[PDB]
Design a protein around this nucleic acid. Structure first.
Lengths: 50, 64, 79, 48
RNA sequence: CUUUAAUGUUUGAUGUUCUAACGUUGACCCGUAAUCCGGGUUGCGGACAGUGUCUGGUGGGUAGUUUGACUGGGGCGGUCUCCUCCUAAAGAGUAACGGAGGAGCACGAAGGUUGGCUAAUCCUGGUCGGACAUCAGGAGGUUAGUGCAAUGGCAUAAGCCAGCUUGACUGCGAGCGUGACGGCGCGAGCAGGUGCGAAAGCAGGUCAUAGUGAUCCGGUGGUUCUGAAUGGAAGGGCCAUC
RNA sequence: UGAACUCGCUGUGAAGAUGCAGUGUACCCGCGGCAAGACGGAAAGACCCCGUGAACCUUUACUAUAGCUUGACACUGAACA
RNA sequence: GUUUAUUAAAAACACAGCACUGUGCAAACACGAAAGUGGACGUAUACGGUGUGACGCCUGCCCGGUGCCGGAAGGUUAAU
RNA sequence: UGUAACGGGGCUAAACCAUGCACCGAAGCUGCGGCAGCGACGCUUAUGCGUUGUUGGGUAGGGGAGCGUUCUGUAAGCCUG
RNA sequence: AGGACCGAACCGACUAAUGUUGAAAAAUUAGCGGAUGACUUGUGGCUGGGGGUGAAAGGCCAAUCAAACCGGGAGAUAGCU
RNA sequence: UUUUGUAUAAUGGGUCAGCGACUUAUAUUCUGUAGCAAGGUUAACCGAAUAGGGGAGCCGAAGGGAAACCGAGUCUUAACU
């Protein structure tokens, strides 16, 4: 869809991913963006979009 | 001949006691990341037809 | 683009005129691209990102002819 | 469903499947049914 | 791990030859001193052909069908959904192939939060200086600027600048504005948790409005709601998505 | 072929009226001829245009196929280069 | 000579001659749930078919685009 | 095309302008006869009478309610050579 | 000797008058092209409606043609007079 | 009959007398009324027979939830809210 959407997992990798509007097409930059993991209901670091 | 319930409505609605039909509603199957988060929190709960919007629906669903 | 294209209506309305009414909350104004040209008084907030003069308590509208410039006061208070 | 144009309303809305098939073999009774039963026991064993 | 021959061998093709499959537009005899045809006897061909069958290719020779609308007519040109100003009538509703400019994406900052700041333009002075850049002084200015068109606001700046920073949040939501409806726009506030600030206080992005297809289909990752005899399974439902 | 005992000019006009208004004129009914009219009688316009209509014709536009053809297969056996 | 029955009688169609591509005989060509029959009792001096157009004497250029024939050198590549 | 750009005559005032009082002027206003509907005031409750007030042209469509026609029953009745 | 050539019949329907609810579903009148031939005509027969037959005209196929006749599907279908 | 508008030289009348063009079941919602009422109704069919019998089925009386699962309650979830 000309946006090539990315999905990351939490620090612990448990439950489902977090889908995000963060783009990879136009610029190479840091993918860590700190988001909510609903298994702990806490804000944590997010990793690996593959 | 015994009069037929229309397939177009029969496989899209759930009935009630008092009247009005309960259903899942649109815009919650196709490409979710591109849609607003407030909208996705408003479409998660299912929808219902009220008595003022019901006449059009029983004209496709005749039976109890 | 134009001519014509026209840019039909642009969703533009005046909405809040005279004493008005709302159940528990009301918009007060709807006129777009407006910040402080109509100034906030009483149970409301100043215009910004959504252009409204939103009031969080049921009130009746009162209109002034003067303010800090220009910047005429629009008051929303209970009756 | 025809309303002059702009499609019948049900053609905008998603399908609902997943049938349960137990209601046609389910009975519903009020407190004043099976209430005497010749002093016997109510159990659904072999009704034929 | 190369390129290739022979010894061995798997599977095809072309050619030759034999004929316990099948052809003869070969003859003779019998039906019958019948240039139809079968049978009978004997020659000639031969796995070629022939006939049917299935999958790919090709193929109007034949059969059915399609080929959007506006356009002060046709035609070249303009146009169909989304943004913005006047026409537009000092409630409400609003047209033209009237006057005039744009969108179908970008940005991790032009953001959040705390603390600071303020343009344009012209002359004089000045220089690595055939013309832009950076500055100093004087006159003058909420006329510069804003990711982009236009429109209006904007200094208590929403314009640029430094520290920390990601609320470009999850789950809920009283509702508020709008169109005939679908649908579109805005959202107090509560609960969870993290972030800024000494703190009172504040953060669900961007100065606002354009940046995108309802559903049916199937795929993708979790669950254990369902699942035709029932314990598993396939397939569906939810949850999370394309 | 609704009722007919159907005058001219000018106005009125679905505006190019015999017939509505005014004004000038006109014996009635025939017959043999005359022919300016009665938008003469004949044709529920042929013309042109509209139509997501119908048909025919252009054609490798869409779809299906006859025929052609590589492969698989049945009548089907054996050997060699 | 032939001709469009009732609106053009011809510059229309037809025989001549020329060219070309097929066809070895159970020919190529043709109609058909398919025999059979027509090609023909003919034999490439025959037959099929498409052009051009009797006669006399003749017939310049382009093979990039379209089709057709052989290859698929080089590409793209089905079935099973 | 022919009275033909008040329809036409009369008219040098009988035209043009505005002024003062009179009159003519609808199916309505207004009076009466009659009807249906709405509601009061006086007398009276077979239920009417008396007076005053008031509405009554209505087509796409929405409501109310009669008279004939035919069959079937009444009809073993009622009319009829 | 000859699709030579004049001229009737014979085959045609070109010229002008005429007809076109006619003498007629095309011939009444005088001319005209062909007239032993790629001719005509009496009898019998063959080729059949997505099928024939044309020196082949979008000609003709029993009143019917860019596609004949019949009954049936059939009360096809008609955003329309 | 039609239309912005028709005496319309607009489509339709020669005439007498006849003909000539709209059914009700399965299913349903509101209305009217009839029986009975938290109940009403049987279908096909048996039957002395149109009496009586036939409650399978159907509609209504209790919902919430994807469904499992709960019930005057119930779903959503970390959820009190």
């Amino acid at each position: 869809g000309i946006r090539e959407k990315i999905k990351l997992v939490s620090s612990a990798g448990t439950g489902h991913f977090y889908t995000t509007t963060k783009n990879k097409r136009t610029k190479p930059e840091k993918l860590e963006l700190k988001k909510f993991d609903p298994v702990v209901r806490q804000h944590v670091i997010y990793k690996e979009a593959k | 001949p015994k009069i037929k319930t229309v397939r177009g409505a029969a496989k899209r609605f759930k009935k009630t006691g008092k009247g009005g039909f309960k259903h899942k509603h649109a815009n919650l199957r196709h490409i979710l990341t591109k849609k607003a988060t407030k909208r996705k929190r408003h479409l998660r709960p299912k929808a219902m037809v009220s008595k003022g919007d019901l006449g059009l629906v029983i004209a496709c669903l005749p039976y109890a | 683009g134009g001519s014509t294209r026209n840019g039909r209506d642009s969703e533009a309305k005046r909405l809040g005129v005279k004493r008005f009414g709302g159940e528990s909350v009301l918009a007060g104004s709807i006129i777009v691209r407006q910040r402080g040209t109509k100034f906030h008084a009483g149970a409301n907030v100043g215009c910004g990102r959504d252009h409204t003069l939103f009031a969080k308590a049921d009130g009746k509208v009162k209109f002034e002819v003067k303010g800090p410039k220009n910047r005429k006061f629009i008051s929303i208070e209970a009756e | 469903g025809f309303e002059g144009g702009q499609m019948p309303l049900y053609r905008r809305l998603p399908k609902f499947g997943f049938t349960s098939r137990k209601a046609a073999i389910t009975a519903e009774i009020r407190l004043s049914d099976l209430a005497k039963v010749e002093g016997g026991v109510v159990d659904l064993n072999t009704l034929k």
